[PDB]
Design a protein around this ligand. Structure first.
Ligand code: CA
Ligand code: CA
Lengths: 124, 124
């Protein structure tokens, strides 16, 4: 199965037991690459690629992201779902909804952790 | 489980073994109402409500449809996913994409079977 993560505690691994709201019986290998957890998406910042408020993002754990990838990012202690774009020592977390400005991260002043790579979505 | 269904054979039920590619281990009651199958969507006709080419539509089997519901419909032996609209003896199956014109059905002339209601999506 796959854990469903609703809240993300500060300064703790995302896959910590205390973050798990419930469980889904779907096999991890349903997705490719294999999913490690499902994360509830909040808001409509990614609606133009069909990821809507309340969807569950299937997430493959990785700490490195490549330009163009849809990633889960922790900026400070806030978790967001955004498209990744790195400009040298700058990172852009791009929304897929013209109503939301790109979030700029200066890797020198702000902590950024990539929590993983989107490998799918479950909508219910 | 939930059977995953690709192409659909003529004059056989959608849940016929010959249509099933594999089973997903997700619980049918993960969805509400409960799903009966997952159907592979083709093309971008429903993109405006976040249903994209290749998505698996979670479907609750029912044979009746109400105006504005996103349904699986079979006209002759072509299966489509569209928004239902009926006035008297005529039905329009509406796209959620401005580039796609309505499919019109004359219920006096053509058989229309509702195969079910959309209750969710799995994208992988
Ligand atoms: Ca920290
Ligand atoms: Ca598939």
């Amino acid at each position: 199965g796959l854990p469903v993560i609703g809240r993300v505690a500060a300064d703790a691994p995302i896959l910590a037991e205390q973050n798990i709201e419930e469980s889904c019986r779907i096999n991890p290998a349903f997705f490719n690459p294999r999913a490690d957890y499902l994360l509830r998406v909040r808001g409509m910042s990614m609606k133009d690629i069909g990821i809507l408020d309340g969807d569950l993002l299937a997430v493959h754990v990785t700490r490195e992201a490549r330009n163009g990838q849809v990633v889960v990012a922790r900026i400070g202690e806030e978790v967001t779902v955004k498209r990744f774009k790195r400009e040298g020592s700058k990172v852009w977390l791009l929304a897929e909804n013209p109503e939301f400005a790109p979030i700029e991260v200066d890797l020198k002043e702000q902590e950024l952790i990539i929590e993983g790579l989107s490998v799918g979505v479950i909508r219910r």
